[PDB]
Subunit: 312 residues, 4 copies
Amino acid sequence: DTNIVTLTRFVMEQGRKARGTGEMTQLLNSLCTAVKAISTAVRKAGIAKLDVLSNDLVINVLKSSFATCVLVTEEDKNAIIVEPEKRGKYVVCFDPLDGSSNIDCLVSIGTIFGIYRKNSTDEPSEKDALQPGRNLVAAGYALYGSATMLVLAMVNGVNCFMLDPAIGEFILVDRNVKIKKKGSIYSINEGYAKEFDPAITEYIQRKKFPPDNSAPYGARYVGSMVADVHRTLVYGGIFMYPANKKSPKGKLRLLYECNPMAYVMEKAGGLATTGKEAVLDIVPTDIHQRAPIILGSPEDVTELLEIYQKHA
Amino acid sequence: DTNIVTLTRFVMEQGRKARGTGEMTQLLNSLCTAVKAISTAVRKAGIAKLDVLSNDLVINVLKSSFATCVLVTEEDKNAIIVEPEKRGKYVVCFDPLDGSSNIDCLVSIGTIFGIYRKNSTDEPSEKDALQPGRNLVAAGYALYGSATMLVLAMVNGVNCFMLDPAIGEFILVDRNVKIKKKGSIYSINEGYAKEFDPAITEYIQRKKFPPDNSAPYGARYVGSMVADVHRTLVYGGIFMYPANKKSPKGKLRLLYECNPMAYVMEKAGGLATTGKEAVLDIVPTDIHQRAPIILGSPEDVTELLEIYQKHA
Amino acid sequence: DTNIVTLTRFVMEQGRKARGTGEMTQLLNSLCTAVKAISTAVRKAGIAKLDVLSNDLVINVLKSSFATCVLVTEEDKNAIIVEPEKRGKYVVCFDPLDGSSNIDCLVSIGTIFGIYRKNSTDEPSEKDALQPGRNLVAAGYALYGSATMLVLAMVNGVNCFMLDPAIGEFILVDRNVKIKKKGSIYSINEGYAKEFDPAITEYIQRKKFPPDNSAPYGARYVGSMVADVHRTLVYGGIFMYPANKKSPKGKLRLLYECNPMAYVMEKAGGLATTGKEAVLDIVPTDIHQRAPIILGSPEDVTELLEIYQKHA
Amino acid sequence: DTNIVTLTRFVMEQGRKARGTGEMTQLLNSLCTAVKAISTAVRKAGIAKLDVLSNDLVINVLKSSFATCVLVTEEDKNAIIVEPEKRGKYVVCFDPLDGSSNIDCLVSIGTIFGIYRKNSTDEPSEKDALQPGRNLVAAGYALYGSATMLVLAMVNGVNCFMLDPAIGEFILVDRNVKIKKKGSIYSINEGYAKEFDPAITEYIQRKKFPPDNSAPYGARYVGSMVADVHRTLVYGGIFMYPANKKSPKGKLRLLYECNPMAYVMEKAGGLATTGKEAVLDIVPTDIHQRAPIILGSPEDVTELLEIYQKHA
Ligand SMILES: [Tl+]
Ligand SMILES: [Tl+]
Ligand SMILES: [Tl+]
Ligand SMILES: [Tl+]
Ligand SMILES: [Tl+]
Ligand SMILES: [Tl+]
Ligand SMILES: [Tl+]
Ligand SMILES: [Tl+]
Ligand SMILES: [Tl+]
Ligand SMILES: [Tl+]
Ligand SMILES: [Tl+]
Ligand SMILES: [Tl+]
């Protein structure tokens, strides 16, 4: 096909008619090189830590885009303040290999990422990173499934891209994605049944045993955030990782997990909340600050927020 | 790798020990070709039903193997009788592509197959396929996730090969696989909560709220039989697709879904029962009949089985 | 490897420390997408005109870099003046599939390219393209051989890049390349023996039968410009496609053949001449204007220029 | 493609007609695996001798085939005798990787092999390999250029398969190949001009300056035997590596270079003579002996042969 839409071309038709210098583009391009290598390594996984190496990889490519100043990793303490010579205006937040554990069982996992723009006239510090999701310029993730699909959500909406392994380019496959309004799938680890706050518990029973005599929601849960979000994004559904006492303020770190997802979600007509407040407005204080997250189709997030409101 | 132990080097080398004709090797070598092609089809089945390409593909590779004579496919009303010029001693039942609907959400999908030996002297027929799972000589499945995997269970063991895309060969990685006795995961579509029979519903409870003040089991359910079974085999645990009111005879078909996995399971030291009898011991009356299926790490399936006749 | 040098990263460390906006980079990146697709299509050539499609491809990607204004193809009459919305400052000259004929015999072929910068304050026209090689900002070519290697020569020197088919990135493999000073290979189509100008003819006899009793030069000639230049670039050697009467002013078009090569050559310490004047200083008058070209190791070009001088 | 005719589907299907044991198929299937791996090794043998990985690889695949017993490799002083546990009825001579030095310049390289049947009853030995080329039962070569090709010539024809990297299978593309009677290309290292014998040197002349006021032949010489032979087979013409003073016995070794190509040539209706006798009719005395080789479209080789005894 003589007219292929590589994501490079596509972001160049978002971040160029907008006159913004297309810095974004080189940052994104670089993320692709890293995402691609992670996919190859993972496909041949069992024939050749992976996340450390994928961390190193992401960082290196990132720096070299000459479009970053601060970087936060799940795998790193201090947010990496990019050296001066290669600086640029963006703050990138990431989980390079989400699900490192799950490779062994061959379950789809991914590289999540959040991006910010430094809102200051100074020298970078991890404070430049402590902005809330409402200030994300773009967030996305790449899933290493039966295909390697990159989902990128910028201010206009969400577009899925898939890796054509032959030409090695993320090709555009879905434009301006919008989630289903209501779903039929609730995804959550019911092993934690006992420790669930009552709001959640009433909800699970409402999905399993619908009072208003419909059919019970189908339970799903790959147990990989990337996978469950994506099934949620396309097929609709509600995904919940509320807090219990074991992980008292939840398990998913805000910064580069709850937030990038929640942004992708909201741009696609999907709510994302902690249970009290939306995940995109919490003022982030520690780069590794955790937060509960409930995302998915609006009419379900809402069917649960009512319930949460009806309990305090 | 220099002395690359291909699936074929492996199957041919063990085949030599039966002082045989070479058809197992031909069969499997040909099946492999359907698998690579399906894997490739799936890795880009979003850049622009599938079941059928996958299906026609399998029938084709298998006819030409000169090793088949009766083929039972999920997709065909009747069995397929291999033309004489090309008939051989084996009978293959297979689901060519499992969970096809699940490919939109990027769920790890697969091809499951079971191979029988035509023991009788008359014209090949369905009856030959109407053998108990116990009788199989070879089984496994090919998984299509982050990597393409082929687990093959024969008289001597269950083994795992992963396709190396660089060379288009299936290479041996896990040898003589054995499942953990007891483990921490139950896998079941909890959406059918109101449908389940008491035995199950008590067991679910026992795992979430464990009576011995222990750690509860985790919940998993990818919703693609192959991903869940492969998880159950590698990490240990239990998977269940019990009969319920929407499906009193089970959902997962016997000949091509239940019996192969069942066989692979028992060969690794797990069990697979319908709660009332071994899956492999069922004598199929119809080539398309279903079965309840509870497979996994022994002690757990057992814990269940007791609950069955603790309720009998 | 966590620190991969993709050509994107490499040109970004040439066209960024130089403050030039890295427009160049997106142009180059785009050429890579096209180059990559051509390689895939060609590898699977005999299992699926190719140059028309590769022409269309190059053009499309090119336009979309938002870095071009004029484009000249071997396969096109009127140099394509890029539409305004996607304009930029560069003029790109190219032969998308050099050797279209040779695919059938499985001989390495390539995509050559020359780049200019519009030296005017107006509306683009093919005049913007009629600059001589001395005004090329960068020239290169990609070879579709047993590997797909891109050779890129900018003002600093030449760097070879090779396609790592797994991650799909041109990885850097040779920095600041310099040709051998003297060679031992003369490459030319001696079928044309008869029509050769005497300067050339004395030279062939001097290579075959060395008067100063050394050993005869090895004759080579893949009969694909890309291939012969590249063998010339690395192993040294002299490549000659002088004019005869059949192709009286030679066969290779200046614009996107003789010139990009000659530039690559000169930046690597290799002369390139028509026989009278250097190929990089001829004022180009017709985009399809032809020119003789002799390139390669300095001490040989020179061993031949003497001879040419000694004949007029 | 659905009914993909693999090299194996092909070799197995013709093998059935000899009412055989299945070793040709095993042999070739195993050889294929060495080829893919070498192709892959070459496609990235610049991102960081080779002969040896390639070599060890071939010996390995072939021992394990359970089809060999004597193996004659370019690289080993002595023949390799397959251990009894693994011996079978075939003898394979092969150059594992040809023109290794030519990989730096990206020259299309290849693996050439010839297979014999051990007819005698004693312990396998060199003598078995000391058979005339006429006696071969199977031959061909695998080319590694823009695409990886496997030409296989057996009793019934010469056929061409191209490796489809997407599936890791060699697929049949050209069927029952036949060379053109006469054609327009001579191929020879003209660097040895002062070394050649009169017969050749007159013939060269006759083609450059054709006496019948005709179109001269074109000159080609990639300098990698496989590329030139494959060209000669597909497009017609002549290739020559005549004996000269630097090499009076020819350069190209007989058993593994000359005889296979020779066989492939004659099977397509070309000829291959040393100028004094058919290449295939030579009875090798040493497994490493060389031969003069002139192969190609009949009429031309003939035109030469006459010149031989027009000079006798
Ligand atoms: Tl992680
Ligand atoms: Tl994480
Ligand atoms: Tl997490
Ligand atoms: Tl299916
Ligand atoms: Tl199924
Ligand atoms: Tl099923
Ligand atoms: Tl061309
Ligand atoms: Tl050209
Ligand atoms: Tl040309
Ligand atoms: Tl060699
Ligand atoms: Tl050789
Ligand atoms: Tl040779």
